[PDB]
Amino acid sequence: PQITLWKRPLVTIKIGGQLKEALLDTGADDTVIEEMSLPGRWKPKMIGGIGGFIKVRQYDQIIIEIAGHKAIGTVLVGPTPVNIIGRNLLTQIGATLNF
Amino acid sequence: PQITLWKRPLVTIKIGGQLKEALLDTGADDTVIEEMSLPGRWKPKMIGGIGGFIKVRQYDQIIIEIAGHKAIGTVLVGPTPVNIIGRNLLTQIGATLNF
């Protein structure tokens, strides 16, 4: 698709068999989702957003559908106002910005 | 142009007579610029993201040149770690997300 930006670019994602809403976020390096359970081991990571740095759980090689496109990659779990799909997975689904 | 997302989507902007680098950010509702002087009236605002909220100054009807495209709109000024072009100005240059 071609998504305009008059509204927030929210899409449906599927992770762990559950549907969630997430924001396509070209200003995010990383994908950050709200607390949920994911399989496997996690590693620590600190990310710095607009208000400061927070700790998150980094899970690698997680299967995630984004707007109907399959991605497999790193998901950070921690307190974010909204689930955000960052460039690590936007690249996997072939997204570009155009103007 | 078509901008891929392997790297941060940074562009040159001109605002207040000043050249700056800024992120094209589909996850940002509003445009947020690091501390600088702008003319006219302003009002305080709080904006929030990962890590919490910061206090900013809201300036209305500010012209920004974004990668050579002129736009006008509200610009927030405050202690953001990065300059952010948000959806309120991305729409005006006709930016879309494509995949």
Ligand SMILES: COc1ccc(S(=O)(=O)N(C[C@H]2CCC(=O)N2)C[C@@H](O)[C@H](Cc2ccccc2)NC(=O)O[C@@H]2C[C@@H]3CCO[C@@H]3C2)cc1
């Ligand atoms: C109302 O207007 C705005 C409100 C908030 C922001 S924001 O900068 O907090 N942010 C909002 C996003 C994230 C939460 C949400 O609902 N939408 C814009 C983001 O693109 C932000 C833009 C950003 C803010 C601060 C630093 C770098 C980028 N990136 C970001 O938080 O990425 C996180 C932090 C890590 C650094 C970059 O990637 C890592 C993942 C911008 C304008």
Ligand SMILES: [Cl-]
């Ligand atoms: Cl505006």
Ligand SMILES: [Cl-]
């Ligand atoms: Cl349009």
Ligand code: NA
């Ligand atoms: Na003004």
